[PDB]
Swiss-Prot record, chain B:
Function: Constitutes the soluble short form (S-MGM1) generated by cleavage by PCP1, which plays a central role in mitochondrial inner membrane fusion and cristae morphology. The transmembrane long form (L-MGM1) and the S-MGM1 form higher-order helical assemblies that coordinate the fusion of mitochondrial inner membranes. Inner membrane-anchored L-MGM1 molecules initiate membrane remodeling by recruiting soluble S-MGM1 to rapidly polymerize into a flexible cylindrical scaffold encaging the mitochondrial inner membrane.
Protein name: Dynamin-like GTPase MGM1, small form
Originating organism: Chaetomium thermophilum (strain DSM 1495 / CBS 144.50 / IMI 039719)
Domain of life: Eukaryota
Subcellular location: Mitochondrion intermembrane space
């Protein structure tokens, strides 16, 4: 069901390009938005981590900025690596460094949502965004 | 590491305590893999639905950019190499 | 000018002159200047590449 | 071979002298590469065309 993942991946690449066309590129493709109450919010963060692999989450979070998670089918790659689009050409092996970096962005706090890209053979390519949960 | 597999082993194993209450073909659905499959399904369906309208919008923004290319510069194409070549030809004639 | 059908020579020559001049303006702009601008770049690129 | 090295070397220097003098009478010993020739003729053509 190879034909199946692919359509989605091409579409996510397209979502990224509409996002990147310009200032007036109001236009875009949808994606999953995740919302959860505080007990529910904690559950949700745990769930997002559990869905693919463990990642820095929860603890003390301003939750001020959304996180656009874009996933890629990772056949032919044997190492769980996640990278940041803005800091291009930078790959992170251990998610502890991802924890320190993105939590430093959490303490920094525009309202712009950081984009993320993570490649793992276990993970099916997706396009979820996690905004702060209700308190 | 390999937390993924582990969270998968527990999900496989836990429903065993009460398999009939929530297990295959039971009305309810649970565990991470079926959820993921459904997420894939819905994402594909909804994205596919918005595809035509988003496509039309892209064509609209392309048309407006093109019209501005008509009003400004009369739609004559230009590359950096064309600009440099023309200016170099001018300078060589002037210098001679 | 009122005897246009009586003087086909003069009329046909006038139409020829007019069509020639208005066609000539657009011809000069669209084609001639395009030649003056593209020709040096094309010569240099093609000669160096050759 | 070592013995003839002196006389042969002198003869080569002689023919080099003659070739050099002809370079003096013809072309006034000014240097020339093919690229210098091509660009000079191209600039001539460009001024002519403009």
């Amino acid at each position: 069901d190879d034909n199946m993942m692919f359509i989605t991946k091409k579409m996510i690449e397209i979502r990224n390009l509409l996002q990147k066309v310009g200032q007036g590129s109001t236009v875009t493709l949808p994606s999953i938005v995740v919302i959860g109450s505080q007990s529910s919010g904690k559950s949700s963060v745990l769930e997002a981590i559990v869905g693919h692999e463990f990642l820095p989450k929860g603890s003390n979070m301003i939750t001020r900025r959304p996180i656009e998670l874009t996933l890629v089918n990772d056949p032919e790659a044997k190492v769980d690596y996640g990278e940041f689009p803005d800091l291009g050409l930078a790959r992170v092996t251990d998610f502890s460094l991802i924890q320190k970096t993105l939590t430093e962005l959490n303490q920094s706090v525009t309202d712009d949502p950081i984009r993320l890209t993570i490649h793992s053979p276990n993970i099916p390519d997706l396009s979820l965004i996690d905004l702060p949960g209700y308190i | 590491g390999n937390l993924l597999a582990s969270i998968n082993r527990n999900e496989k194993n836990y429903f065993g305590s009460h398999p009939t209450e929530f297990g295959p073909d039971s009305g309810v659905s649970t565990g991470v893999m079926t959820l993921r499959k459904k997420l894939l399904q819905v994402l594909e369906q909804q994205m596919s639905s918005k595809l035509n309208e988003t496509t039309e919008a892209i064509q609209r923004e392309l048309e407006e950019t093109t019209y501005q290319f008509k009003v400004q510069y009369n739609e004559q194409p230009m590359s950096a190499e064309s600009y440099l070549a023309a200016s170099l030809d001018d300078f060589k004639h002037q210098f001679h | 000018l009122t005897n246009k059908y009586y003087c086909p020579e003069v009329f046909l020559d006038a139409v020829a002159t007019k069509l020639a001049q208005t066609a000539v303006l657009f011809l000069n702009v669209e084609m001639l200047n395009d030649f003056y601008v593209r020709f040096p770049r094309e010569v240099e690129a093609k000669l160096h590449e050759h």
